[PDB]
Ligand binder design. Sequence first.
Ligand SMILES: NC(=O)C1=CN([C@@H]2O[C@H](COP(=O)(O)OP(=O)(O)OC[C@H]3O[C@@H](n4cnc5c(N)ncnc54)[C@H](OP(=O)(O)O)[C@@H]3O)[C@@H](O)[C@H]2O)C=CC1
Ligand SMILES: NC(=O)c1ccc[n+]([C@@H]2O[C@H](COP(=O)([O-])OP(=O)(O)OC[C@H]3O[C@@H](n4cnc5c(N)ncnc54)[C@H](O)[C@@H]3O)[C@@H](O)[C@H]2O)c1
Ligand SMILES: NC(=O)c1ccc[n+]([C@@H]2O[C@H](COP(=O)([O-])OP(=O)(O)OC[C@H]3O[C@@H](n4cnc5c(N)ncnc54)[C@H](O)[C@@H]3O)[C@@H](O)[C@H]2O)c1
Lengths: 378, 379, 174
Amino acid sequence: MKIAIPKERRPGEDRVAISPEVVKKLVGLGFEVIVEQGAGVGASITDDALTAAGATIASTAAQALSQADVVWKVQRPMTAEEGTDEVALIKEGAVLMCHLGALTNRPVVEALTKRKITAYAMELMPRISRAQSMDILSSQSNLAGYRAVIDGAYEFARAFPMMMTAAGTVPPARVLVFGVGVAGLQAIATAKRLGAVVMATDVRAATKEQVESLGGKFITVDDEAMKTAETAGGYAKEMGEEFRKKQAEAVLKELVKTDIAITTALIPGKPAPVLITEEMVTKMKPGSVIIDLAVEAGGNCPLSEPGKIVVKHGVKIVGHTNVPSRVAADASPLFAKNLLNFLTPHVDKDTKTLVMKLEDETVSGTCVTRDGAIVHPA
Amino acid sequence: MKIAIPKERRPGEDRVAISPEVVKKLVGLGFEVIVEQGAGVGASITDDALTAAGATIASTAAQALSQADVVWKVQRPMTAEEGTDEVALIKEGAVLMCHLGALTNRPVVEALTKRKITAYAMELMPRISRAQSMDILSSQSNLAGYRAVIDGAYEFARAFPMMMTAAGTVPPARVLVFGVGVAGLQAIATAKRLGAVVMATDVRAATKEQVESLGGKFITVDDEAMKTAETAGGYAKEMGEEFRKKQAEAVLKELVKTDIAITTALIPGKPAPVLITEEMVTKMKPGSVIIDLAVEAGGNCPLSEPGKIVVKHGVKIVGHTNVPSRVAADASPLFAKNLLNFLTPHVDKDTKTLVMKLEDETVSGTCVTRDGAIVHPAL
Amino acid sequence: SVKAGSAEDAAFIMKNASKVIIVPGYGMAVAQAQHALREMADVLKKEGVEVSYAIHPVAGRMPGHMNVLLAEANVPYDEVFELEEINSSFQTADVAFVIGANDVTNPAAKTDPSSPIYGMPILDVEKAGTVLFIKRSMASGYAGVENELFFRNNTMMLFGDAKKMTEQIVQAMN
Ligand SMILES: NC(=O)C1=CN([C@@H]2O[C@H](COP(=O)(O)OP(=O)(O)OC[C@H]3O[C@@H](n4cnc5c(N)ncnc54)[C@H](OP(=O)(O)O)[C@@H]3O)[C@@H](O)[C@H]2O)C=CC1
Ligand SMILES: NC(=O)c1ccc[n+]([C@@H]2O[C@H](COP(=O)([O-])OP(=O)(O)OC[C@H]3O[C@@H](n4cnc5c(N)ncnc54)[C@H](O)[C@@H]3O)[C@@H](O)[C@H]2O)c1
Ligand SMILES: NC(=O)c1ccc[n+]([C@@H]2O[C@H](COP(=O)([O-])OP(=O)(O)OC[C@H]3O[C@@H](n4cnc5c(N)ncnc54)[C@H](O)[C@@H]3O)[C@@H](O)[C@H]2O)c1
């Protein structure tokens, strides 16, 4: 059996769906691991080290994928229209696991369907406790939360920590993080590390204890209606205009004192909720930064533009795309192990085969297509 | 008695020699604080905020300095030889106070002398506890050391802290700080609070303790040689090439595992000592960075280039210029507080003039020219 | 001519105190005694005693040396105070717990024109009822000058390491 990993061809994607450690275990399951030449240069993962882990190396993408029974990518394959038909390079009938973005990319799904390819979209991993070690949303949003604070600090003309000095007290920065998810919690931790004062807010009332354990102060808005705001999986729902104005008002007291504002809020299905409007940035101090991690999903701030730092009203509004890739050398070995944990339970004890348990809800909620038949209820 | 503060004309210089707090204290001491418009826009100190504190916002650089008994700026004035005669705009017989870099820049001192201006080179501030409040080297170096860590974290493709997750563990970054002065000590602090393992090294004996006091480990080289490595005001000496060899070999064990190397080493008057050679960056693993705070005076690593992020042998050698300006909004109110603490004791109380005491150790050692004659011994 | 003392000695004094102000310095950083210090802090706060920190501009060996280490030990910003904003409180303070600080407290800055430390504004630890002084020996600070405070009735020298002495003081308390 043969598993294969190409270099990511999409612009600015320095991640790779493999690591030396993860290759070791793949060989122990009975796979031949082939990796494209220079596939992990952006993640500081060398060709030598992959081969040292027990992996062949292909010169080209097509050469790595030619007789590959299973294929691991990070980002979704490019279609013929997009520039380079990577879907064609995959061997007909092989299984394909990656961040497919399937619910918004129907063209790439049915192209794989034309070649009997069984594609597993990892971003659809259900929110059950046992599949956290397989979750790519989670492992990558963690690093995205850290990176946001590093980006704020880079774009900020002041220093984070309080320092009493002979020239005078330099005050601590005031971070305020909207949305205390995986990314929000890491942002609080990282900003607190650098000596900031960190406020934060969320619709989910369970999140209150989490912020205060990291050393932050919580912003209460609707103590009653926040208990009726959490779903089965743990993600947020829509709150409407009533709550949006009680929040925008309650948070304004701190936002005019805020230096760095990190916004992470997401609502599955719907666009990202507006937490900071243009009217709100006018009240903010000049020299302030806003990091909008939800920018690729509309944004929590409408002023932010994907891939651009936007200066309006004396406030830099950062909207970097693919934030996790800005930490590729950490994001990659974590992405590789997400896939190793998804695949491991369905590999036979001694048989050299991949029997993907269709009963397993890890497999049911993930499988987009199989053998030329789109099984996902989309 | 007029004191004017212009905009910094030099490229890549967002700082200003004033803040609202200092304007309040100045006018209260009996000054009329003028300041060119847009002076502190790069430091987030708006024109309105300055007039609120009690300042006149002049239109141009000429108008502000024309009738000013004192001038404060951050970097030295430009001369006619550099295309812009900033020194011409300063009133005859006035008092300039800035970072002149007078020892390396003789031309600007002669131009200030032809106008009979009394210039105070604020970088020649003697190293004493009495005058640490007046010291621009420290306040700006400190922020530059913080910056180096912020910049290293930016260009680096892993996260500083160790992280234990459901998907697995990622190790912390490993920082190596060469040169443990004011800058390097705040770099050891900023890296260590971000969760990195922080090694460091120096040539002065009393440094080993200082590195450990922040929570980093020290790399010794010749504990019988670091004994006589300090000088008058705590500065370091030159060490020849028999120490340059002995440092690189012991360092090499740790440099091979280093992700981010911050180099702050710098000798006063002379250029920077080479602590990381090209041969050493070959042995550094791909994905590494070197932040070189000494780039503007030789560089601790020859590969680094002013204002550029060069990439050789897999290593992002970063080498920004004017690093305290990369923190301009905190760096400026400090710089202004330094200028203020130096000037405050010399304001004649009941008359609203100023007289600089000659026997004052802080004035004697910082004065470069006075009443149209070069004063400093070393010029 | 110096009144020495043990950890149990200093335990009795701060337990029976209405207000303590901790004055950390370079010695506190060397010993890495900041986690132990904030422990001594919130055993005193638990029994009701008013605790604050007085940070001199040039404590330690760098700008903000004290701040980053206190920040590591989770001492909240509201308890930490700068020189100009806290020097009056020493009058209304039973104890100035000076842990690893010397030059910062030295009154020779205003009683010795010849001294090099002269001119620099200092923390008035002498204005407090009594003063604890944790340092390994009788050695001078950075500036290399004898402290007038070292020997006089309102002062007590706890000789030793700042981490071990402060850990021994927490044990003497409950
Ligand atoms: N902050 C800055 O930017 C800089 C400051 N400075 C100078 O530092 C001085 C600041 O003084 P300050 O911070 O109050 O302290 P000092 O430097 O005056 O000395 C602190 C005292 O604590 C001691 N000590 C050392 N190790 C330990 C230990 N493990 N346990 C207990 N005590 C220890 C020493 O005494 P013993 O050895 O007897 O225990 C020493 O006398 C000023 O003169 C300032 O100008 C200098 C350069 C930079
Ligand atoms: N396998 C698993 O069990 C698993 C995987 C990921 C997350 N989770 C859990 O799910 C929860 C959410 O984490 P996430 O990273 O998936 O969240 P997410 O990426 O879906 O959204 C980020 C955060 O934005 C918040 N938010 C949305 N709309 C908002 C508004 N109008 N105002 C304020 N905040 C708003 C949400 O509450 C959420 O915490 C966490 O508790 C996490 O532990 C579990
Ligand atoms: N009296 C005071 O209150 C006071 C306040 C601040 C600073 N200072 C003193 O000023 C002095 C200088 O500080 P700075 O930040 O300007 O230092 P600096 O800018 O001169 O250089 C930074 C560091 O580079 C190191 N270095 C030089 N050549 C080297 C080599 N070949 N290899 C390795 N390291 C090398 C030096 O030891 C120094 O610590 C310090 O000793 C400090 O104690 C005194």
